[PDB]
Every structure is written in C-alpha cells, then in structure tokens.
Amino acid sequence: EEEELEELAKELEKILRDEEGHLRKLKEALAEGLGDAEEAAELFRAESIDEMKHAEELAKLLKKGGLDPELRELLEELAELELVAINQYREAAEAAAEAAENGSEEARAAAREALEEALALELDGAKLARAALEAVEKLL
C-alpha cells in the first residue's frame, strides 16, 4: 500500500512543479503586454498539452482501487480543473492567433482576458496539487 502511494505522490510532485512553471511563464507574457502574439499563441498551445498529460495520469490513478475517499475527491477536483484549463488555453491561443494576423484591438483585449482567466485557474491548480500532495504525505 505504501509504494502505490509513493508513486502517486511522485505524480503530484511533477504536476505541482509543472503548474508552478506555467504560473511564472504566464505572468511573464502578461508583463510583456502582447509582445509577439505568436509567442503567446505558441506558448498556450504547448501548455494545454502539458495539462493534457496531467489529466490523463490522474484518470489512470482514479481507475485504481483502495483510494482514500477524500483523496479521490481531491484528484477528481484536480482532473476537472485540468480540463477547464485546457479549454481556456485554447480560447487564449485562438484570440492571440486572431490578434497576430489582424492586429485587432478587440482580439488584443480578448487575448488578455483569456490570459488572465487561465492564470486564475493555474493558481488553484497548484493549490489543489499542493493540498493533494499534503494529504498523501499524511497517509505516509
């Protein structure tokens, strides 16, 4: 029982580190304004694939048995948070792609709102991965 929790705790550690990374790169784009719209559009598309990997690992562990009821709910909440983040990453990438081709002032503000909304979802993603890793550490 201990070594299936250890591997699981290794997973939240990777997810937690990846979330803390996306946090900083997102404010960096926020600091640079739009900068190169292609920069943000290429960055969003890559990080949505990162959240892709996270939700897939969690679902495989969610199919496992013997999980503590409270631990399963935190993983279920995180997996839900990942799918909504993959959404907002796509809405922000398309708004940055429309701003790159057009120079549109509306596609600019729309890419910034979707950037800011993706940032708020990333704060709670790291917070949920922190609380989940803390619960597993208590079980160990």
PDB file of C-alpha atoms in Angstrom:
ATOM      1  CA  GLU A   1       0.000   0.000   0.000  1.00  0.00           C
ATOM      2  CA  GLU A   2       2.893   2.333   0.766  1.00  0.00           C
ATOM      3  CA  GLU A   3       4.589   2.074  -2.637  1.00  0.00           C
ATOM      4  CA  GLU A   4       1.433   2.792  -4.637  1.00  0.00           C
ATOM      5  CA  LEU A   5       1.018   5.965  -2.575  1.00  0.00           C
ATOM      6  CA  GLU A   6       4.696   6.821  -3.097  1.00  0.00           C
ATOM      7  CA  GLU A   7       4.425   6.647  -6.890  1.00  0.00           C
ATOM      8  CA  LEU A   8       1.194   8.640  -6.691  1.00  0.00           C
ATOM      9  CA  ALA A   9       2.940  11.260  -4.544  1.00  0.00           C
ATOM     10  CA  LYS A  10       5.666  11.375  -7.202  1.00  0.00           C
ATOM     11  CA  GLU A  11       2.952  12.284  -9.721  1.00  0.00           C
ATOM     12  CA  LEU A  12       1.552  15.282  -7.829  1.00  0.00           C
ATOM     13  CA  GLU A  13       5.140  16.480  -7.394  1.00  0.00           C
ATOM     14  CA  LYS A  14       5.598  16.538 -11.174  1.00  0.00           C
ATOM     15  CA  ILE A  15       2.184  18.163 -11.661  1.00  0.00           C
ATOM     16  CA  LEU A  16       2.877  20.687  -8.888  1.00  0.00           C
ATOM     17  CA  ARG A  17       6.244  21.627 -10.396  1.00  0.00           C
ATOM     18  CA  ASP A  18       4.733  21.914 -13.881  1.00  0.00           C
ATOM     19  CA  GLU A  19       1.925  24.126 -12.560  1.00  0.00           C
ATOM     20  CA  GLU A  20       4.362  26.436 -10.757  1.00  0.00           C
ATOM     21  CA  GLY A  21       6.248  26.774 -14.035  1.00  0.00           C
ATOM     22  CA  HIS A  22       3.181  27.699 -16.092  1.00  0.00           C
ATOM     23  CA  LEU A  23       2.355  30.257 -13.395  1.00  0.00           C
ATOM     24  CA  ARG A  24       5.582  32.197 -13.921  1.00  0.00           C
ATOM     25  CA  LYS A  25       5.635  31.979 -17.729  1.00  0.00           C
ATOM     26  CA  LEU A  26       2.068  33.330 -17.778  1.00  0.00           C
ATOM     27  CA  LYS A  27       2.843  36.485 -15.785  1.00  0.00           C
ATOM     28  CA  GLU A  28       5.921  36.907 -17.991  1.00  0.00           C
ATOM     29  CA  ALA A  29       3.655  37.094 -21.037  1.00  0.00           C
ATOM     30  CA  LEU A  30       1.352  39.369 -19.030  1.00  0.00           C
ATOM     31  CA  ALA A  31       4.309  41.641 -18.238  1.00  0.00           C
ATOM     32  CA  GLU A  32       5.401  41.839 -21.894  1.00  0.00           C
ATOM     33  CA  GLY A  33       1.893  43.017 -22.879  1.00  0.00           C
ATOM     34  CA  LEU A  34       1.087  41.118 -26.008  1.00  0.00           C
ATOM     35  CA  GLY A  35       4.652  41.273 -27.284  1.00  0.00           C
ATOM     36  CA  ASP A  36       4.715  38.887 -30.211  1.00  0.00           C
ATOM     37  CA  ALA A  37       1.193  37.477 -30.483  1.00  0.00           C
ATOM     38  CA  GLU A  38       2.767  34.360 -31.983  1.00  0.00           C
ATOM     39  CA  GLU A  39       4.817  33.997 -28.782  1.00  0.00           C
ATOM     40  CA  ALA A  40       1.709  33.717 -26.602  1.00  0.00           C
ATOM     41  CA  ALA A  41      -0.200  31.608 -29.140  1.00  0.00           C
ATOM     42  CA  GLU A  42       2.687  29.137 -29.355  1.00  0.00           C
ATOM     43  CA  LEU A  43       3.019  29.156 -25.555  1.00  0.00           C
ATOM     44  CA  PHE A  44      -0.665  28.491 -24.836  1.00  0.00           C
ATOM     45  CA  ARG A  45      -0.807  25.612 -27.319  1.00  0.00           C
ATOM     46  CA  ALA A  46       2.185  23.949 -25.649  1.00  0.00           C
ATOM     47  CA  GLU A  47       0.937  24.321 -22.070  1.00  0.00           C
ATOM     48  CA  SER A  48      -2.506  22.944 -22.943  1.00  0.00           C
ATOM     49  CA  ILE A  49      -0.688  19.760 -23.975  1.00  0.00           C
ATOM     50  CA  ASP A  50       1.047  19.841 -20.585  1.00  0.00           C
ATOM     51  CA  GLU A  51      -2.320  19.923 -18.803  1.00  0.00           C
ATOM     52  CA  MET A  52      -3.306  17.170 -21.245  1.00  0.00           C
ATOM     53  CA  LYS A  53      -0.701  14.856 -19.713  1.00  0.00           C
ATOM     54  CA  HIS A  54      -1.765  15.759 -16.167  1.00  0.00           C
ATOM     55  CA  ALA A  55      -5.444  14.878 -16.591  1.00  0.00           C
ATOM     56  CA  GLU A  56      -4.508  11.586 -18.274  1.00  0.00           C
ATOM     57  CA  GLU A  57      -2.271  10.446 -15.409  1.00  0.00           C
ATOM     58  CA  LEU A  58      -4.934  11.324 -12.830  1.00  0.00           C
ATOM     59  CA  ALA A  59      -7.659   9.344 -14.612  1.00  0.00           C
ATOM     60  CA  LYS A  60      -5.450   6.240 -14.701  1.00  0.00           C
ATOM     61  CA  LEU A  61      -4.906   6.526 -10.943  1.00  0.00           C
ATOM     62  CA  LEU A  62      -8.622   7.240 -10.493  1.00  0.00           C
ATOM     63  CA  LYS A  63      -9.361   3.831 -12.035  1.00  0.00           C
ATOM     64  CA  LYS A  64      -7.267   2.244  -9.276  1.00  0.00           C
ATOM     65  CA  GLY A  65      -8.939   0.940  -6.137  1.00  0.00           C
ATOM     66  CA  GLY A  66      -8.138   1.261  -2.463  1.00  0.00           C
ATOM     67  CA  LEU A  67      -8.024   5.058  -2.724  1.00  0.00           C
ATOM     68  CA  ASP A  68      -8.984   7.057   0.351  1.00  0.00           C
ATOM     69  CA  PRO A  69     -12.399   8.691  -0.286  1.00  0.00           C
ATOM     70  CA  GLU A  70     -11.097  12.184   0.497  1.00  0.00           C
ATOM     71  CA  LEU A  71      -8.001  11.659  -1.657  1.00  0.00           C
ATOM     72  CA  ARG A  72     -10.146  10.535  -4.597  1.00  0.00           C
ATOM     73  CA  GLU A  73     -12.237  13.704  -4.341  1.00  0.00           C
ATOM     74  CA  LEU A  74      -9.171  15.958  -4.466  1.00  0.00           C
ATOM     75  CA  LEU A  75      -7.897  14.099  -7.533  1.00  0.00           C
ATOM     76  CA  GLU A  76     -11.370  14.358  -9.078  1.00  0.00           C
ATOM     77  CA  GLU A  77     -11.393  18.106  -8.416  1.00  0.00           C
ATOM     78  CA  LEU A  78      -7.916  18.481  -9.935  1.00  0.00           C
ATOM     79  CA  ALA A  79      -8.778  16.485 -13.067  1.00  0.00           C
ATOM     80  CA  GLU A  80     -11.846  18.690 -13.538  1.00  0.00           C
ATOM     81  CA  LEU A  81      -9.644  21.769 -13.104  1.00  0.00           C
ATOM     82  CA  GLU A  82      -7.240  20.489 -15.775  1.00  0.00           C
ATOM     83  CA  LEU A  83      -9.941  20.044 -18.426  1.00  0.00           C
ATOM     84  CA  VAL A  84     -11.244  23.579 -17.874  1.00  0.00           C
ATOM     85  CA  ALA A  85      -7.668  24.876 -18.124  1.00  0.00           C
ATOM     86  CA  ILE A  86      -7.159  23.079 -21.447  1.00  0.00           C
ATOM     87  CA  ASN A  87     -10.283  24.949 -22.569  1.00  0.00           C
ATOM     88  CA  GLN A  88      -9.096  28.414 -21.537  1.00  0.00           C
ATOM     89  CA  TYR A  89      -5.663  27.714 -23.024  1.00  0.00           C
ATOM     90  CA  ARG A  90      -7.356  27.103 -26.385  1.00  0.00           C
ATOM     91  CA  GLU A  91      -9.595  30.176 -26.141  1.00  0.00           C
ATOM     92  CA  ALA A  92      -6.492  32.248 -25.372  1.00  0.00           C
ATOM     93  CA  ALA A  93      -4.477  30.722 -28.222  1.00  0.00           C
ATOM     94  CA  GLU A  94      -7.170  31.476 -30.811  1.00  0.00           C
ATOM     95  CA  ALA A  95      -7.504  35.048 -29.534  1.00  0.00           C
ATOM     96  CA  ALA A  96      -3.731  35.501 -29.825  1.00  0.00           C
ATOM     97  CA  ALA A  97      -3.755  33.969 -33.313  1.00  0.00           C
ATOM     98  CA  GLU A  98      -6.503  36.373 -34.388  1.00  0.00           C
ATOM     99  CA  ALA A  99      -4.522  39.243 -32.849  1.00  0.00           C
ATOM    100  CA  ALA A 100      -1.337  38.237 -34.695  1.00  0.00           C
ATOM    101  CA  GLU A 101      -2.954  38.232 -38.139  1.00  0.00           C
ATOM    102  CA  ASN A 102      -5.243  41.233 -37.600  1.00  0.00           C
ATOM    103  CA  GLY A 103      -3.577  43.491 -35.095  1.00  0.00           C
ATOM    104  CA  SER A 104      -7.134  43.765 -33.790  1.00  0.00           C
ATOM    105  CA  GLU A 105      -7.577  45.826 -30.634  1.00  0.00           C
ATOM    106  CA  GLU A 106     -10.542  43.640 -29.646  1.00  0.00           C
ATOM    107  CA  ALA A 107      -8.612  40.410 -30.237  1.00  0.00           C
ATOM    108  CA  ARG A 108      -5.905  42.028 -28.090  1.00  0.00           C
ATOM    109  CA  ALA A 109      -8.159  42.636 -25.079  1.00  0.00           C
ATOM    110  CA  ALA A 110      -9.854  39.272 -25.648  1.00  0.00           C
ATOM    111  CA  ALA A 111      -6.465  37.537 -25.602  1.00  0.00           C
ATOM    112  CA  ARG A 112      -5.587  39.362 -22.383  1.00  0.00           C
ATOM    113  CA  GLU A 113      -8.828  38.424 -20.602  1.00  0.00           C
ATOM    114  CA  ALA A 114      -8.370  34.772 -21.587  1.00  0.00           C
ATOM    115  CA  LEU A 115      -4.735  35.015 -20.465  1.00  0.00           C
ATOM    116  CA  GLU A 116      -5.820  36.392 -17.087  1.00  0.00           C
ATOM    117  CA  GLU A 117      -8.551  33.765 -16.692  1.00  0.00           C
ATOM    118  CA  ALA A 118      -6.058  30.994 -17.470  1.00  0.00           C
ATOM    119  CA  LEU A 119      -3.799  32.493 -14.792  1.00  0.00           C
ATOM    120  CA  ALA A 120      -6.503  32.274 -12.112  1.00  0.00           C
ATOM    121  CA  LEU A 121      -7.152  28.628 -12.999  1.00  0.00           C
ATOM    122  CA  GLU A 122      -3.411  27.928 -12.724  1.00  0.00           C
ATOM    123  CA  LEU A 123      -3.253  29.390  -9.204  1.00  0.00           C
ATOM    124  CA  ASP A 124      -5.864  26.933  -7.936  1.00  0.00           C
ATOM    125  CA  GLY A 125      -4.291  24.097  -9.917  1.00  0.00           C
ATOM    126  CA  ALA A 126      -1.076  24.449  -7.930  1.00  0.00           C
ATOM    127  CA  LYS A 127      -3.111  24.907  -4.740  1.00  0.00           C
ATOM    128  CA  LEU A 128      -5.078  21.708  -5.377  1.00  0.00           C
ATOM    129  CA  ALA A 129      -1.934  19.758  -6.267  1.00  0.00           C
ATOM    130  CA  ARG A 130      -0.399  21.106  -3.047  1.00  0.00           C
ATOM    131  CA  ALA A 131      -3.314  20.001  -0.859  1.00  0.00           C
ATOM    132  CA  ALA A 132      -3.467  16.607  -2.583  1.00  0.00           C
ATOM    133  CA  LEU A 133       0.266  16.031  -2.080  1.00  0.00           C
ATOM    134  CA  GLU A 134      -0.171  17.078   1.560  1.00  0.00           C
ATOM    135  CA  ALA A 135      -2.955  14.538   2.132  1.00  0.00           C
ATOM    136  CA  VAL A 136      -0.870  11.703   0.670  1.00  0.00           C
ATOM    137  CA  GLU A 137       2.050  12.784   2.858  1.00  0.00           C
ATOM    138  CA  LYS A 138      -0.215  12.438   5.902  1.00  0.00           C
ATOM    139  CA  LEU A 139      -1.200   8.921   4.805  1.00  0.00           C
ATOM    140  CA  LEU A 140       2.531   8.107   4.620  1.00  0.00           C
TER     141      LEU A 140
END
